[PDB]
Amino acid sequence: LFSSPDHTLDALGLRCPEPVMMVRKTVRNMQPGETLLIIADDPATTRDIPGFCTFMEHELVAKETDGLPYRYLIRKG
Amino acid sequence: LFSSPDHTLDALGLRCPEPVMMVRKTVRNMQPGETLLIIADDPATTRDIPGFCTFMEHELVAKETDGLPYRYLIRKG
Amino acid sequence: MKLPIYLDYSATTPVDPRVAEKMMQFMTMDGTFGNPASRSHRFGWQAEEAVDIARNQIADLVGADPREIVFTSGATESDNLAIKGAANFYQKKGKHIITSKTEHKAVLDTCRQLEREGFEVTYLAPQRNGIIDLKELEAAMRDDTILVSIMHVNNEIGVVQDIAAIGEMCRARGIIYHVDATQSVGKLPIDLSQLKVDLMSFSGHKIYGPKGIGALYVRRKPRVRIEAQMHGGGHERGMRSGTLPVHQIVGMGEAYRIAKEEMATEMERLRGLRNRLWNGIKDIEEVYLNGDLEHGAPNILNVSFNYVEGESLIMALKDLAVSSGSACLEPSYVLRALGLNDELAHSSIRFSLGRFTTEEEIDYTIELVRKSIGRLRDLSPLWEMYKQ
Amino acid sequence: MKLPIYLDYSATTPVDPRVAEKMMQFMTMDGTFGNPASRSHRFGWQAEEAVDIARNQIADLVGADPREIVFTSGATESDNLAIKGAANFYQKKGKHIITSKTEHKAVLDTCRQLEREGFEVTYLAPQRNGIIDLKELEAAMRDDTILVSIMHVNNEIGVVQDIAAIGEMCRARGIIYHVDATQSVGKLPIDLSQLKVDLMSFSGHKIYGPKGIGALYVRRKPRVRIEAQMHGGGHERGMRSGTLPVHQIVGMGEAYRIAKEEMATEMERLRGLRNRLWNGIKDIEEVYLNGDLEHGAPNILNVSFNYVEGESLIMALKDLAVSSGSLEPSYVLRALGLNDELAHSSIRFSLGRFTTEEEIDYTIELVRKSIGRLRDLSPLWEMY
Ligand SMILES: *Cc1c(COP(=O)(O)O)cnc(C)c1O
Ligand SMILES: *Cc1c(COP(=O)(O)O)cnc(C)c1O
């Protein structure tokens, strides 16, 4: 389910609010429907990234938060 | 020439930009045509007060700057 | 109505149409876009006149003289300016400062910065209705106490401090008194010609003015002085340097003018709506009012809902734009200062009303809260525990 | 055209209509009025998106990463933040700072405050053309030198410093280099991915954005750090706390976007008009160009007029909205060596987006016969 991401984003080492900043910019230069693999180790992303999806009308395909690093598959709405 | 002023203003002890600040305010609750006697000892008023008259479309009736304190008679335009 | 319903006026308010109408006249080429510092031509002189008008509109609201008004970029800067400015100027008389644990971050964080600069600061715990005990304040005062900072209205629970009394205590001992009045301005009556406050901060976006603008009242008599924190030309009588944002200042002035006018009527209306909201939920089994209903701001209502998971509470009331005061993680530092345990603090909601709030919206809110708390407590293992 | 003619774009510029209509959408109830710090609802999340868009537009102009962009209330604060922030953070490495005598007050007065706080500051005198001699700079540097601050484009005379070379000099010695680029931004190309600048300040109202907003570039790699001067919640990633003024931020971003777009064409037009104006007055007997025609900003022309009384000069050019940089005369011209009388009769012509050929020709003629009829009445000119 993390096999076919159109774009990837190495957010390792980044801490709030940087991870979401990078996500905002990357999602803006993406086509509606493309996917983005987000790799992070900022614990806040377990809250921030799904929040980015809820409040910004985007779809959270699949998350991995039970260990480091985390993984988030996002599909641009 | 300084005998019949409608309003008075003691600006003694005041320093730029205060004197002109007080003039703006006093001229604001003045009727168009009334006169204001300004007493000041701020050297800058020799430039600033006629400047207030030039750029704010007001009329400088009579100034007195050959000593302290200074005296300016303006008529609300 | 529209959805979601905005009940977060304490975080920020929408700009008044009249305010935005004025601001738009001091921006483009065909407006008064001039720099108030350009003394050589008219573009500068008439922009300066507008600044003066707005400066008097602001002063008239709080009963001060325009010369006592120092323009800043907001309440944060004003709090930094006042506290750091006074601490530095009067350090020869002492290095001890007193404040409250429930103050806004701008005050608290400024104090910690002064602590790492050699200053000693006392953070007073509040009584659990939010009120500061003046006897504990007095017991903290000393010979080397130069400054006290206690806010007018608390931004999270809305409690009102007795700033007049605190001013009396300070003036009598030659202590500088700073009040953060960001939440109280245009809501509670303020007259600096009577109050014994030396420094007071206010903003624009809490009272339907634009963000990015604020002011700091600096007492003229008895004269209070501060060290500027912003250098570069000695503007604002040497207390705050930088270009004057005309359109912003005009907007804040116009907002303060409107405030003075609609204040008495609007606050009675909000006080009514606030009481309407509390009475509609106060009979729910385990809810708690955080603050003081009878001497709290007319616009703020902080309520705790017991035996519900806080995270789901915000999601259940998604029809409402509110706040929990949570930081980022962990819960409001103001609530745990009062003594609420982390879980109760998490499941607390701060309803704040404004001049767009209708009875229609309050009744919708009342129903939604009743229905949601009942629904959540059904799914709640925690609530099952309470019923035993 | 209309009168008076505005030739004071260096003091401030008018807000671009495009910029203004963007700002209007982030103020009232039916706009994006939310607080970008309210994480519990969409009013805040959407306001934060607009902030991010503007943050990237600003970064794209100067070739930086959005994470390096710190929002301030203007260039004044940016200069204060950069200088005081770096001075305090790196004081364990030394307390000596170097700057220029012709820097904007925000820089000079900030350094003076730091001297009062125990720091040592060297104010270098410029050359006659306004240019700093890099060898005099090198000689000023020491082991305990932690910070250098030298602006890109001078706001009075428009002279352009060699900030690339200065950056090379600083980085090589581990010295922090701050650049005040308030006048150069949107006028001269800037690429921080190439430039060896650690800190850079810019504003909005100098390139047709709104007053009361600005930013500070803080290099991410090699990592540069500063101590915050504004405390209260640790916003802007711990470097500048306070609520983000979205409408202001949007206006500044939009202004930076337009700048990146119309930069090349507009600056060609500007230095074209700039050369048109100088050619039209350069043959008046005793006039003097302050700065450098060949490496000065394309939008600034500082000219001194000899044997004329300064006070009356500004009155004779009543049809023009200009500046003299002045009872006391420009400290920049004084630094250049101009005597006080010459400095008082110096005029700074600054061009902009609305300046036309027609206005320049009108200006040329106004200057010709103004200087002529002033020197008629001048006992000063009679002796010459
Ligand atoms: C909002 C607020 C501030 C900060 O105001 P800004 O202008 O956004 O910096 C300070 N104190 C209190 C009590 C506030 O509610
Ligand atoms: C105008 C200017 C500043 C000040 O910018 P503000 O945002 O108005 O405070 C600083 N440096 C230079 C070179 C300037 O021209």
Residue numbers in the entry:
A (entry chain C), B (entry chain D): 4 to 80
C (entry chain B): 1 to 328, 333 to 392
D (entry chain A): 1 to 326, 333 to 390
Quote the paper.
The cysteine desulfurase IscS is a highly conserved master enzyme initiating sulfur transfer via persulfide to a range of acceptor proteins involved in Fe-S cluster assembly, tRNA modifications, and sulfur-containing cofactor biosynthesis. IscS is a highly conserved, widely distributed pyridoxal-5′-phosphate (PLP)-dependent enzyme, with 60% sequence identity between the enzyme from Escherichia coli and its human homolog, NFS1. It initiates intracellular sulfur trafficking, delivering the sulfur to several sulfur-accepting proteins such as IscU, ThiI, TusA, and MoaD/MoeB that commit the sulfur to different metabolic pathways, including iron-sulfur cluster assembly, thiamine and biotin synthesis, tRNA modifications, or molybdopterin biosynthesis. The small domain (residues 1–15 and 264–404) contains the critical active site cysteine Cys328.
TusA interacts with the large domain of one IscS subunit within the dimer, with the exception of the tip of the loop containing the essential Cys328 of IscS, which comes from the other subunit. Most of the IscS residues involved in the interaction with TusA are located on the outside face of a six-turn helix α2, the N-terminus of strand β2, the C-terminus of the neighbouring strand β9, and the following loop β9/α7. The residues of TusA contacting IscS are located on two α-helices (α1TusA and α2TusA), which are nearly perpendicular to helix α2IscS. Formation of the complex buries the α-helical layer of TusA and leaves its β-sheet layer exposed to the solvent. The main van der Waals contacts are provided by TusA Met24TusA, Met25TusA (α1TusA), Phe55TusA, Phe58TusA, Met59TusA (α2TusA) and IscS Trp45IscS (stacking with Phe58TusA), and the aliphatic portions of Arg55IscS and Arg237IscS. The conformation of the Cys328IscS loop in the IscS-TusA complex, with the donor and acceptor cysteines in close proximity, suggests that the observed conformation is close to that expected in a transfer-competent state.
